[PDB]
Amino acid sequence: AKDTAAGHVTTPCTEILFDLTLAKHYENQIQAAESALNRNYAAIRSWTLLEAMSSDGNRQNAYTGLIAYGIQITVNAEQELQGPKQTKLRAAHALRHRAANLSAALQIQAAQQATLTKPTAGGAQTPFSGATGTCKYEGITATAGEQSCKYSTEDEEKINAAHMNPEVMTQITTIGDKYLTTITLDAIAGSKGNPTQSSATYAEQDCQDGGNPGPNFGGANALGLQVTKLGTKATTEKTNLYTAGGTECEHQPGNGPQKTKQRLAYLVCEANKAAIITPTDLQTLTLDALISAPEMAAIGDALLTDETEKEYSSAQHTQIQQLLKKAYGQTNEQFQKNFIKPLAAQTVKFKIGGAEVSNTVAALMSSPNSGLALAYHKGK
Amino acid sequence: AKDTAAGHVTTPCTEILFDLTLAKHYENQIQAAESALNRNYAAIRSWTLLEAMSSDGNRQNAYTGLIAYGIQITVNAEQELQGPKQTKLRAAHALRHRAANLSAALQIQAAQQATLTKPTAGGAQTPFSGATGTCKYEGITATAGEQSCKYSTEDEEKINAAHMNPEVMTQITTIGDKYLTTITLDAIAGSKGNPTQSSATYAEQDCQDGGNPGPNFGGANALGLQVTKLGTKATTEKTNLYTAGGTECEHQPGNGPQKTKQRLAYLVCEANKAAIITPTDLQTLTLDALISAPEMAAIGDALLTPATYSSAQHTQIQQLLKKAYGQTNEQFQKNFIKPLAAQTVKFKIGGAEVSNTVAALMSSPNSGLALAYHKGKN
Ligand SMILES: *[C@@H]1O[C@H](CO)[C@@H](O[C@@H]2O[C@H](CO)[C@@H](O[C@@H]3O[C@H](CO[C@H]4O[C@H](CO)[C@@H](O)[C@H](O[C@H]5O[C@H](CO)[C@@H](O)[C@H](O)[C@@H]5O[C@H]5O[C@H](CO)[C@@H](O)[C@H](O)[C@@H]5O)[C@@H]4O)[C@@H](O)[C@H](O[C@H]4O[C@H](CO)[C@@H](O)[C@H](O)[C@@H]4O[C@H]4O[C@H](CO)[C@@H](O)[C@H](O)[C@@H]4O[C@H]4O[C@H](CO)[C@@H](O)[C@H](O)[C@@H]4O)[C@@H]3O)[C@H](O)[C@H]2NC(C)=O)[C@H](O)[C@H]1NC(C)=O
Numbered sequence: 001a002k003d004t005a006a007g008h009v010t011t012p013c014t015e016i017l018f019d020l021t022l023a024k025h026y027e028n029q030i031q032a033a034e035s036a037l038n039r040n041y042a043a044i045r046s047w048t049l050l051e052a053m054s055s056d057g058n059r060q061n062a063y064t065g066l067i068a069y070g071i072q073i074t075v076n077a078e079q080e081l082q083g084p085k086q087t088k089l090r091a092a093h094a095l096r097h098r099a100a101n102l103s104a105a106l107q108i109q110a111a112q113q114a115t116l117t118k119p120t121a122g123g124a125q126t127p128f129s130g131a132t133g134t135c136k137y138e139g140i141t142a143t144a145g146e147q148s149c150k151y152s153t154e155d156e157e158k159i160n161a162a163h164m165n166p167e168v169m170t171q172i173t174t175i176g177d178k179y180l181t182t183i184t185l186d187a188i189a190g191s192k193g194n195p196t197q198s199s200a201t202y203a204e205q206d207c208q209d210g211g212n213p214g215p216n217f218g219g220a221n222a223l224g225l226q227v228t229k230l231g232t233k234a235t236t237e238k239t240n241l242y243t244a245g246g247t248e249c250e251h252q253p254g255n256g257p258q259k260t261k262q263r264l265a266y267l268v269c270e271a272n273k274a275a276i277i278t279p280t281d282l283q284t285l286t287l288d289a290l291i292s293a294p295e296m297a298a299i300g301d302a303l304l305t306d307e308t309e310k311e312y313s314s315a316q317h318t319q320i321q322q323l324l325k326k327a328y329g330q331t332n333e334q335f336q337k338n339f340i341k342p343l344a345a346q347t348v349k350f351k352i353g354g355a356e357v358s359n360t361v362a363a364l365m366s367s368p369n370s371g372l373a374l375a376y377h378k379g380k
Numbered sequence: 381a382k383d384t385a386a387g388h389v390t391t392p393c394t395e396i397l398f399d400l401t402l403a404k405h406y407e408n409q410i411q412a413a414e415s416a417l418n419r420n421y422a423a424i425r426s427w428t429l430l431e432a433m434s435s436d437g438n439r440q441n442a443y444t445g446l447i448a449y450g451i452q453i454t455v456n457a458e459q460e461l462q463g464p465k466q467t468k469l470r471a472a473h474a475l476r477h478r479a480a481n482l483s484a485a486l487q488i489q490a491a492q493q494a495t496l497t498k499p500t501a502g503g504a505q506t507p508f509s510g511a512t513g514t515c516k517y518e519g520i521t522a523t524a525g526e527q528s529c530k531y532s533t534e535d536e537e538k539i540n541a542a543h544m545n546p547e548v549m550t551q552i553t554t555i556g557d558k559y560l561t562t563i564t565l566d567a568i569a570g571s572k573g574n575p576t577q578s579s580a581t582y583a584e585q586d587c588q589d590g591g592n593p594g595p596n597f598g599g600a601n602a603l604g605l606q607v608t609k610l611g612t613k614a615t616t617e618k619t620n621l622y623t624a625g626g627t628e629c630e631h632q633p634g635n636g637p638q639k640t641k642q643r644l645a646y647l648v649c650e651a652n653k654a655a656i657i658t659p660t661d662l663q664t665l666t667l668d669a670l671i672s673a674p675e676m677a678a679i680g681d682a683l684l685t686p687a688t689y690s691s692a693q694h695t696q697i698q699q700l701l702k703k704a705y706g707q708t709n710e711q712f713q714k715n716f717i718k719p720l721a722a723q724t725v726k727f728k729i730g731g732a733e734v735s736n737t738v739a740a741l742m743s744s745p746n747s748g749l750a751l752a753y754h755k756g757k758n
């Protein structure tokens with residue numbers, strides 16, 4: 001059940017797909033948390049206008065309670081996100097950098113056929129100081145066409161963010177370092193007769209001397225070489241994320257130099273361990289969620305009591321809760337109606353310095369006229 | 381005079397430096413704007429608390445004007461940032477991707493010396509069907525030590541964000557494509573006597589037999605080869621960022637396939653055009669900045685006394701603003717700016733003692749709680 005995604009990595013292209021998919025996963029987690037913060041801050045702006053439009057002291061106090069609750073939880077969550085966000089971005093960055101690296105090495109290791117140039121025949125020249133004949137080539141090249149990664153339906157099912165929850169990941173798979181450092185080639189030389197400096201008929205891209213030079217080794221004395229294949233084998237390597245106990249990161253830095261895969265496993269381990277805590281969605285808050293939130297015990301005592309310093313007893317909390325039900329309604333439907341539905345449904349319109357505003361509450365408070373509408377209504 | 385940084389790109393490592401430096405420039409432009417938005421919202425939370433602790437209705441009105449002005453300008457700048465942010469991030473990503481690509485190619489193109497394997501002596505075999513001897517090698521390899529980019533202080537001064545304003549950038553410099561696609565090598569075959577399939581003494585990583593084999597074709601018959609040099613030479617290419625008018629981006633996508641360098645040029649040009657406007661810093665606002673901000677005309681008219689503005693009305697609103705916020709900047713600083721860091725706020729409610737300055741408290745895990753306490757006393 002574990003390691004479905006990493007266990008499917010067998011090739012440069014599938015490691016690339018793993019590396020990019022995991023990077024986007026972490027990036028998506030940061031985005032979802034920040035969109036949730038954005039919605040919470042937009043709700044607090046909406047309730048700030050609604051408080052400014054209340055004439056009821058009790059309703060006014062109810063909106064102020066939601067502003068105070070939302071500010072506390074959203075500011076706290078934004079502050080809490082910063083550590084995990086930076087840990088997850090560090091991993092995502094390295095994974096995309098590794099995938100780029102591999103994609104470039106993939107293009108070069110795909111160059112598997114050589115283009116021979118016209119050699120020059122010689123005698124005893126370095127590095128063959130004991131040869132009687134040498135055939136010397138310069139600027140042999142090997143190039144492949146533009147390489148692309150192509151993926152099977154199985155590839156995309158297994159190497160998928162659905163398989164990248166922290167609880168199923170114990171290892172990563174990487175292509176071995178020689179794929180990124182080493183050129184590998186096969187070559188063969190061939191001799192015939194007595195190749196010498198005179199073996200200077202090159203039409204066959206070799207060094208043919210003096211018989212009837214021509215195709216294959218036509219001349220009585222021929223010498224040549226050919227690079228017959230190039231390309232380094234991509235071998236796969238496994239790296240563990242955790243130590244024996246299953247909790248600590250295995251490749252913590254500071255224990256000497258590390259292979260690329262060891263650096264990556266550490267970053268992935270820490271990014272998996274850095275679970276983001278997404279705050280409550282204010283815009284879809286429910287009455288029972290609100291009254292059960294422990295922050296609303298002290299906030300309710302601040303706004304809804306008449307007269308507590310010390311910590312609340314059981315009877316004191318249940319008092320605060322009934323005050324909370326009075327302020328916010330006794331049923332969710334009332335709560336939704338008077339505090340949630342006004343965000344999208346309540347219409348606000350005004351006109352001040354020659355500037356007509358006609359929006360609904362949440363859209364207006366996230367618009368260029370937002371602060372002008374707050375000043376207008378706090379002014380009446 | 382223009383293109384100082386791109387004009388210093390002469391090697392793979394200086395293109396890498398240029399690519400990363402420009403990417404960080406775009407990234408730091410976004411971070412500067414988003415850092416301003418963060419400080420603004422934290423100022424607005426600070427003034428929200430200062431308003432709730434205010435007993436004077438007129439001083440309360442003043443804080444609500446700062447709250448309203450800040451929310452208006454910060455919400456607007458946040459929304460305006462999103463387009464340019466995405467355009468600059470598109471460029472920064474691609475530039476970091478190119479730099480990674482070029483770094484990986486450099487590691488491979490630095491492999492300049494081969495290690496031979498032990499060969500196998502043959503007779504005629506493909507691709508040498510006429511040979512009397514062949515000497516066949518499998519898995520010859522070329523590897524460099526770990527490559528780094530070493531930069532001079534002149535590199536870092538010329539390839540620098542200070543040389544990457546939009547007005548000085550007309551081209552980019554890139555290493556030509558063959559550096560990233562093509563292996564280049566030199567090789568030489570050597571023969572002596574009559575090499576045959578019996579030339580199976582391989583101590584020299586060549587094929588020898590007869591006589592006294594050993595170094596430099598010591599045997600009576602010998603054949604072998606050596607790859608004496610590897611590495612493709614990196615050449616530079618220039619790409620223009622703008623079309624003939626000098627304002628619209630060249631190499632726009634949707635005109636057939638493009639070279640890597642042309643895709644990069646378009647992204648850089650659009651990122652250069654997508655200028656980010658950083659909002660006014662609320663936490664360091666001066667009085668003249670506040671009263672002369674055009675948003676404060678309507679915002680003062682709404683809270684300080686509202687027409688639905690002549691020359692006169694604008695004069696009237698200005699002195700209304702000086703009335704609320706101060707006649708001097710030292711007063712405005714003292715009453716509205718300095719208390720964010722200098723005014724300690726304390727209280728006690730939920731069995732929790734809380735003491736902090738205003739701005740720190742309104743960004744702390746007790747921020748909303750402090751707001752409910754003071755709006756509750758009021
Ligand atoms: C760092 O270093 C790395 C490593 O070297 C670099 O990474 C490489 O970068 C290159 C260049 O970007 C990559 O190669 C390009 O890949 C493009 C993306 O393709 C994917 O996504 C697109 C969606 O945008 C999708 O269409 C593709 O799927 C197609 O192919 C699969 C596989 O068969 C198939 O399942 C799909 O059905 C699609 O097939 C259609 O299209 C194929 C051609 O693409 C046809 O062969 C097929 O019959 C079918 O029609 C894929 O999922 C891709 O768009 C690029 O292809 C372009 O450009 C090529 C030249 O570069 C050219 O040879 C191709 O023919 C194609 O050109 C055509 O399409 C483009 C885009 O629409 C048009 O602008 C052109 O005008 C042209 O259109 C004609 O042909 C059309 C289709 O035939 C036709 O409709 C139209 O009418 C026209 O006649 C490249 O393949 C490469 O993948 C990367 N490699 C690796 C290993 O990562 C990296 O760049 C570098 N980074 C930096 C910053 O330096």
Ligand SMILES: *[C@@H]1O[C@H](CO)[C@@H](O[C@@H]2O[C@H](CO)[C@@H](O[C@@H]3O[C@H](CO[C@H]4O[C@H](CO[C@H]5O[C@H](CO)[C@@H](O)[C@H](O)[C@@H]5O[C@H]5O[C@H](CO)[C@@H](O)[C@H](O)[C@@H]5O)[C@@H](O)[C@H](O[C@H]5O[C@H](CO)[C@@H](O)[C@H](O)[C@@H]5O)[C@@H]4O)[C@@H](O)[C@H](O[C@H]4O[C@H](CO)[C@@H](O)[C@H](O)[C@@H]4O[C@H]4O[C@H](CO)[C@@H](O)[C@H](O)[C@@H]4O)[C@@H]3O)[C@H](O)[C@H]2NC(C)=O)[C@H](O)[C@H]1NC(C)=O
Nearest residue numbers: 094097098101255256257258260483484487527528529531
């Ligand atoms: C994608 O592919 C990429 C391409 O393949 C790949 O990139 C490569 O990554 C590797 C791995 O990270 C890189 O190698 C590492 O490079 C580190 C940095 O090396 C350079 O800088 C060092 C520090 O010296 C500078 O800074 C000092 C302090 O500020 C100054 O006092 C110096 O004057 C000097 O300043 C100059 O350079 C600064 C940076 O450019 C610059 O800010 C400043 O202005 C000024 O210009 C240098 O020491 C180092 O030089 C070493 O190597 C060069 C080779 O050219 C020699 O000429 C020198 O003689 C010297 O030996 C570079 O200039 C290294 O720190 C790091 O080294 C450690 O690890 C390796 C093994 O991996 C060991 O061999 C080495 O000894 C080090 O190990 C030890 O020390 C550490 C302490 O840090 C210790 O913890 C550890 O236990 C151990 O004891 C390593 O070599 C490589 O550079 C990248 N290459 C390229 C082309 O980019 C990338 O990883 C891939 N990415 C993914 C995701 O896969």
